[PDB]
Design a protein around this ligand. Sequence first.
Ligand SMILES: [Mg+2]
Ligand SMILES: [Mg+2]
Ligand SMILES: [Mg+2]
Ligand SMILES: [Mg+2]
Ligand SMILES: [Mg+2]
Ligand SMILES: [Mg+2]
Ligand SMILES: [Mg+2]
Ligand SMILES: [Mg+2]
Ligand SMILES: [Mg+2]
Ligand SMILES: [Mg+2]
Ligand SMILES: [Mg+2]
Ligand SMILES: [Mg+2]
Ligand SMILES: [Mg+2]
Ligand SMILES: [Mg+2]
Ligand SMILES: [Mg+2]
Ligand SMILES: [Mg+2]
Ligand SMILES: [Mg+2]
Ligand SMILES: [Mg+2]
Ligand SMILES: [Mg+2]
Lengths: 117, 66, 153, 70
Amino acid sequence: RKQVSDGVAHIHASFNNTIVTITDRQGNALGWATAGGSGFRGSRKSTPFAAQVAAERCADAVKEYGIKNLEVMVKGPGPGRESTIRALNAAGFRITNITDVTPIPHXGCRPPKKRRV
Amino acid sequence: KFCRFTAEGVQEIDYKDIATLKNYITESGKIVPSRITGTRAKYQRQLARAIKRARYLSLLPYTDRH
Amino acid sequence: PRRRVIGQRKILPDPKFGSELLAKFVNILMVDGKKSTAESIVYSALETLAQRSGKSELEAFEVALENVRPTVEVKSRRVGGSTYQVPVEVRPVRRNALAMRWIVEAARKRGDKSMALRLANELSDAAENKGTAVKKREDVHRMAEANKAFAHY
Amino acid sequence: PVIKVRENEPFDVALRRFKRSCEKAGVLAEVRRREFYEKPTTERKRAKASAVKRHAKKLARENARRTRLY
RNA sequence: CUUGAGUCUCGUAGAGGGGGGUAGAAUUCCAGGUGUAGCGGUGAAAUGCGUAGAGAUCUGGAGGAAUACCGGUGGCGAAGGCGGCCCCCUGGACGAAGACUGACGCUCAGGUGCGAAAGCGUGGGGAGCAAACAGGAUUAGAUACCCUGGUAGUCCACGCCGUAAACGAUGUCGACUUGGAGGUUGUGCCGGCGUGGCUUCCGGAGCUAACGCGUUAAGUCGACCGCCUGGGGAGUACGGCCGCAAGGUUAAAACUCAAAUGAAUUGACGGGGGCCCGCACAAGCGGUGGAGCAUGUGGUUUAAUUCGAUGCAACGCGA
Ligand SMILES: [Mg+2]
Ligand SMILES: [Mg+2]
Ligand SMILES: [Mg+2]
Ligand SMILES: [Mg+2]
Ligand SMILES: [Mg+2]
Ligand SMILES: [Mg+2]
Ligand SMILES: [Mg+2]
Ligand SMILES: [Mg+2]
Ligand SMILES: [Mg+2]
Ligand SMILES: [Mg+2]
Ligand SMILES: [Mg+2]
Ligand SMILES: [Mg+2]
Ligand SMILES: [Mg+2]
Ligand SMILES: [Mg+2]
Ligand SMILES: [Mg+2]
Ligand SMILES: [Mg+2]
Ligand SMILES: [Mg+2]
Ligand SMILES: [Mg+2]
Ligand SMILES: [Mg+2]
């Protein structure tokens, strides 16, 4: 439907999953995809290949907005950070920006306890 | 190295002197470690106090992402 | 082995066609050192397949081998107590070794009467992607592609 | 780390500038360090252990340039 | 009397303490926009959340707690401890030059005060975390470790408790006894040359059971205090004192043993590390385990079923 052509790509890259969301520059989600919804569970969901496929799919989903030039917000420590941007550049977008937006507390709240495994 | 604040007779570091302080913060806005700049310990403390003051008055940012 | 110095072994070419590949095929078909039996089976199968395809012996062979040779397989690598099927590219020597082995196994678990006719029919079906040997190629390829995410250790 | 894609700068080179800006700001190490609470005793202990073994490494080294191997 | 001790002048560094204020980052919740099928979690899952629109993303708002970077075997403090920034009140330490008092000192049973965390009382507060608890897993079981939740509590004020591997497992004060490299903070003389405080690492003699300590002594001495006298019973019982309570503190005996213990040595072992090797895996080919039979063995049987071998390394073995 509508035409925007200047989007923002948000990559939420956790240890367990990767979520790719494309919005306009004002924050409105045009489309999204996830590694865990792109045909990958458990040991496969948390790999850079599953994130690449998720980013493929999210590019394929926002096709009918004619998005042409993308900004990239990367958030989180997970495997799917680099691969997602390498697949956004491939899918057809002109990546104009790459920022890390991982939230860092300046102290903040007490984290959960250490796992004993 | 070469702590620049000793060589120039510095008594205080003057948070209002933003031009000087910008040399000691990164692009993120974090204070550069004295092991990188070679600032002497006393002046590193003066510099930290000055940067925190300048940040409070919105002369320097806390972060790159405000 | 741990040490590593496996100097390769001289294999004669087949007498009738002078092909090292066909001699490897005879060796893979041979049972109990009875090479004369295996050569007679292979030559009968190749002559039959060439009459039923018109092509030639050592070309219909390489056409059946072409549709069975795997391109990528999976090796197990245990990580978290459990295992990761890791895709790895198959070396051409191993491509042909596995193609020949799968063709012979398929022709063995067939229903025609003699081994020569079973091998001829398996080779004919492999030249159009219809036998159990190309089914094994397809299964191996789909496993490697289902594990493509793990193409790293 | 906010890298601007520059003109005629291909993708690979800007991506590598971004990877180094991140690995320089230590985003990933800060994230890993904030995943679980660490008791102050554990914090002080790992700090002291790193100091002691860095010092021991410099000392063993500067005596290693006083020993011969063959 | 002035050298121990102390006063004054001038200056210095400091997360020293008490009180108040404030800033930015982030979590959670609340409302709203976009958007759609997943999210979350794990070794793998499930519980849980989500089409009643979650997760993601964006705008606004509420609230609590903690202060990234600086940051440092860096600093301060009697110890416990103390970390954003600003102001108010306030303690100690150190230096330089002198002036002043004139042994005013050291230690300290009993006494008195301070004293992490947990905990207790009253009143507030409650984001995040999280004993108990609940569910999901794992397991032979799993009152656990892992997961999803979650209440005290963690925060504040006041009052109590008085204990910690409250550790340097090293009481305090004073004197003396080769060095080397740093850290931090003063100061004289001109980056170089001195002189003070505190501090980290190595190491000499000496000391030590050894490990190690080594001018910040565990060296050489002096003053005073505290404490020990085999292991277990037991820091327990009884009594006293203290405490709202939990309990703290002081503190036995019977009985029982011939040890218990420290350091270091040689091995062996590790679900410690490193480096290598073997049909050890991997890559392969053919088997055994099923059938019938041969043969040995166990067992059972028998008058006797002769004796021996009987994890690998006995079982077509002595034969
Ligand atoms: Mg967790
Ligand atoms: Mg006393
Ligand atoms: Mg408490
Ligand atoms: Mg209370
Ligand atoms: Mg209450
Ligand atoms: Mg829990
Ligand atoms: Mg005690
Ligand atoms: Mg302590
Ligand atoms: Mg200590
Ligand atoms: Mg003690
Ligand atoms: Mg020493
Ligand atoms: Mg008692
Ligand atoms: Mg009592
Ligand atoms: Mg094998
Ligand atoms: Mg059998
Ligand atoms: Mg017998
Ligand atoms: Mg016997
Ligand atoms: Mg015997
Ligand atoms: Mg034997």
